[PDB]
Amino acid sequence: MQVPILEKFCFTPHTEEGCLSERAALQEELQLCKGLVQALQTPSQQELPRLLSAACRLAQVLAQERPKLPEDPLLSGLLDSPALKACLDTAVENMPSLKMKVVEVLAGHGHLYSRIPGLLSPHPLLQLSYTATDRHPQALEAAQAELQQHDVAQGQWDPADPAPSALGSADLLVCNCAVAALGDPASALSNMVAALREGGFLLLHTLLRGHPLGDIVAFLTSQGILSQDAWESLFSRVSLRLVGLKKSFYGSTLFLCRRPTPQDSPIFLPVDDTSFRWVESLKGILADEDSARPVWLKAINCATSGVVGLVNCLRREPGGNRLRCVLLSNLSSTSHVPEVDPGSAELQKVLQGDLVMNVYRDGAWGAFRHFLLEEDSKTFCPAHKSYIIAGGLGGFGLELAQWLIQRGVQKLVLTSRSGIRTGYQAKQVRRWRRQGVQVQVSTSNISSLEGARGLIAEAAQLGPVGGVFNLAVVLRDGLLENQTPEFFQDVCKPKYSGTLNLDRVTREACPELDYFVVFSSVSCGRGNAGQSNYGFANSAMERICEKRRHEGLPGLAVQWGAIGDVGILVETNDTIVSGTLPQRMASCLEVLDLFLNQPHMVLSSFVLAE
Ligand SMILES: NC(=O)C1=CN([C@@H]2O[C@H](COP(=O)(O)OP(=O)(O)OC[C@H]3O[C@@H](n4cnc5c(N)ncnc54)[C@H](OP(=O)(O)O)[C@@H]3O)[C@@H](O)[C@H]2O)C=CC1
Ligand SMILES: O=C(C1CC1)N1CC[C@@H](Cc2n[nH]c(=O)n2-c2ccc(-c3ccc4occc4c3)cc2)C1
Numbered sequence: 001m002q003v004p005i006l007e008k009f010c011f012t013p014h015t016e017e018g019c020l021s022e023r024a025a026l027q028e029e030l031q032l033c034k035g036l037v038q039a040l041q042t043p044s045q046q047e048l049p050r051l052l053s054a055a056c057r058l059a060q061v062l063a064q065e066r067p068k069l070p071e072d073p074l075l076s077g078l079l080d081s082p083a084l085k086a087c088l089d090t091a092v093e094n095m096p097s098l099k100m101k102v103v104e105v106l107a108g109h110g111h112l113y114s115r116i117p118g119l120l121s122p123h124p125l126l127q128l129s130y131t132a133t134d135r136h137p138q139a140l141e142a143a144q145a146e147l148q149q150h151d152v153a154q155g156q157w158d159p160a161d162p163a164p165s166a167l168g169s170a171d172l173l174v175c176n177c178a179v180a181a182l183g184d185p186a187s188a189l190s191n192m193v194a195a196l197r198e199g200g201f202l203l204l205h206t207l208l209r210g211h212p213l214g215d216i217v218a219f220l221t222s223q224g225i226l227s228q229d230a231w232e233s234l235f236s237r238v239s240l241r242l243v244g245l246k247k248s249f250y251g252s253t254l255f256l257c258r259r260p261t262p263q264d265s266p267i268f269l270p271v272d273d274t275s276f277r278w279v280e281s282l283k284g285i286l287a288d289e290d291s292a293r294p295v296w297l298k299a300i301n302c303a304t305s306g307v308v309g310l311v312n313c314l315r316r317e318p319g320g321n322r323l324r325c326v327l328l329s330n331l332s333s334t335s336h337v338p339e340v341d342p343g344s345a346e347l348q349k350v351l352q353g354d355l356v357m358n359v360y361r362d363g364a365w366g367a368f369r370h371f372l373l374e375e376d377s378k379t380f381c382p383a384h385k386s387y388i389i390a391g392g393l394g395g396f397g398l399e400l401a402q403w404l405i406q407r408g409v410q411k412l413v414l415t416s417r418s419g420i421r422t423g424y425q426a427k428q429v430r431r432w433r434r435q436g437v438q439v440q441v442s443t444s445n446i447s448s449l450e451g452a453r454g455l456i457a458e459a460a461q462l463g464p465v466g467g468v469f470n471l472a473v474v475l476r477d478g479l480l481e482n483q484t485p486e487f488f489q490d491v492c493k494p495k496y497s498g499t500l501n502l503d504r505v506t507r508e509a510c511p512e513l514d515y516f517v518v519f520s521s522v523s524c525g526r527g528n529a530g531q532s533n534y535g536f537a538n539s540a541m542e543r544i545c546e547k548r549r550h551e552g553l554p555g556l557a558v559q560w561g562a563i564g565d566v567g568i569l570v571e572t573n574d575t576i577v578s579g580t581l582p583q584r585m586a587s588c589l590e591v592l593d594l595f596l597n598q599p600h601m602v603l604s605s606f607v608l609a610e
Helices: 022-041 047-057 062-073 082-094 114-118 137-148 186-193 211-222 227-239 280-288 309-313 345-353 395-406 423-434 448-462 485-511 522-527 532-548 584-596
Strands: 005-014 013-017 099-105 127-134 152-155 170-176 196-209 242-249 252-258 267-270 294-300 323-328 355-362 364-372 386-388 413-414 440-441 464-470 514-520 557-560 602-608
Touching: 013 364, 013 386, 013 514, 022 047, 022 127, 022 532, 047 062, 047 211, 082 114, 082 242, 082 252, 082 364, 099 114, 099 186, 114 127, 127 137, 137 152, 137 267, 170 186, 186 196, 196 211, 196 227, 211 464, 227 242, 227 252, 242 345, 242 448, 252 464, 267 280, 280 294, 280 485, 294 485, 309 355, 309 485, 309 522, 364 485, 386 395, 386 448, 386 485, 395 413, 395 423, 395 584, 413 448, 440 448, 448 464, 448 485, 464 485, 464 602, 485 514, 485 532, 514 522, 522 557, 522 602, 532 557, 532 602, 557 584
Parallel strands: 013 242, 099 127, 099 170, 127 152, 170 196, 267 294, 294 323, 323 355, 386 413, 386 464, 413 440, 464 514, 514 557, 557 602
Antiparallel strands: 005 364, 005 602, 196 252, 242 252, 355 364
16 A cells, blocks of 8 residues: 655744754753753763763864764754755745756765755655765765765865856755854855856755854864854855744754845736636736746735645746745734835845745745644544535545545535436445435535525534535636636636635534535645646635634645546546656545544645655
8 A cells, every 4th residue: 555745734934943942852952961061161872962071071082073973963953854844845946947956065064965865855746966065075985875875976075166067057055064164154155156056045054153052062162153143144245145044942053045136027916806807917927928027926915815826836837937926814813914015125025035935924924835744543423413525426525425424424415516417426325325324415506605505504404514525626727828717717616715605604604513624736735737727726725724723613625636546637546647646545535534633724645656
């Protein structure tokens, strides 16, 4: 049986502080290191404590143990955390193509080769070129086995000098200089910038002076350890723009920077109009093949806008590199809504970063990011309650119905606009009824408030509504050039409107609701060419679930990859799509058990082709 990649999808601020605070081991090791340093002036077997104690016994000691030091948990803490992935994925999302050329500076003591390829490897489409470099060839000798496994190329580069020609036009430069010394930082960073293509990223990991870890190390080692202000001043000096910042509770820091690109005048298009008239406008804008002006889609008046999933899909289409977006999405009504009109200081900052995804949520700018699901028992259902599957006669719908029945559901309402149309559907319904399950086939349409209200009423007769499942879908596939507002309306009706209506009706009339679940897609989460409308519709459903959960209502969006055995896509299982395999229904149903038992608002499941 195949093993899916299971992730949570979370709003992630660009700037995060106090990272790794939950980790007891690091908090415990820091306290110890602080005590040892205090002793010199006046877990325990980790490299930094062992080194300090040796100092307590007393350069010869320090020099000997230096290669071992970067792998100390405190020194490597941010690196073995979701902060690293967040930064990398931001870079990836802002690449003009599926290729990313990566060069590691001072790899000998940096050790990013043992993390970055492996973190990006589960990406099904990404073409990674990774070169580990250092000043001396001897520096990378002990890592050869690791480098070989990950297909990491090698290079000679002392950052005090300009980069060799081979390493230039890089998309991403990475450096862990927590232990490794850059030498003169200004000169080092200057050469690093030159090695980047315009729009390329720099990812620096380091220790901050004026914070415990950095101060502890600086003491031990008496160029050098720098303050945060010093680093940020250096970035400005070499024309780098800081677009990401992750700081641990002990003062280790990931700086994500970007080399700017000369910017043509941006085109602003509001995508809030309910009639989808902006579609026609956007088609005209993209139709200009010659134009290199970036296209900035603005969602400002609707927190449930699907612009994010829209953008993901349009980025995969011709002229997609031009696309950017801004989304204002407060979960709290009390939160301030910033002004992002063209004159504004808030908008200027965003334009300077030039990031594809700019989402404002409750006081912070950031973007939605994927993270490996930590959680990695079978659920059961209240047998007296009624359960509703919109699109319940479909491929996934019939399997979900079976699944629910297995878990005790006796009362089901399956909605479909045109009712039973296949022999398979007819047989399953009859069989379930024979088994004693109350199964109602409804034509009530959640696309309208009236239809949503009638549907709940129909379910309420069988029993109180315990669960709603939105599997309704209508597809209007095609590149944006061949799209229309009407087609956008058709695709959004079962999903955006359906979920808005279900949200409202269940709020008003379903106080015993335990489950509110929508089936999203990787088309929204990752992007699929020719499905921008579908990307939008799904994205909007996710936004709604998030708002609900903030208010303490049930809400869950599942981003499914290709589904096997049954469904639109199969209508097969061995058919590779975008480096992924269709997930066998049996695998899907096991994942659902896990997902229903989950605190997170938006989840993701897909299967990688080996
Ligand atoms: N199949 C796949 O590979 C994947 C599926 N998706 C998601 O999974 C879910 C189920 O997909 P799948 O089973 O493959 O699709 P199917 O086409 O097999 O079934 C979906 C059903 O939705 C019904 N429907 C459409 N609009 C409405 C409406 N307004 N009210 C009631 N019913 C409606 C349709 O029937 P009728 O026309 O009679 O109304 C249709 O039978 C969807 O939400 C989809 O986005 C996610 C990832 C990949
Ligand atoms: O929703 C539907 C059906 C109901 C309409 N789907 C069918 C397959 C998929 C959309 C699609 N069609 N063709 C095609 O190649 N895809 C696809 C696009 C992207 C990714 C994918 C997955 C994980 C990833 O992680 C990082 C990047 C990335 C990309 C997988 C598949 C959904």
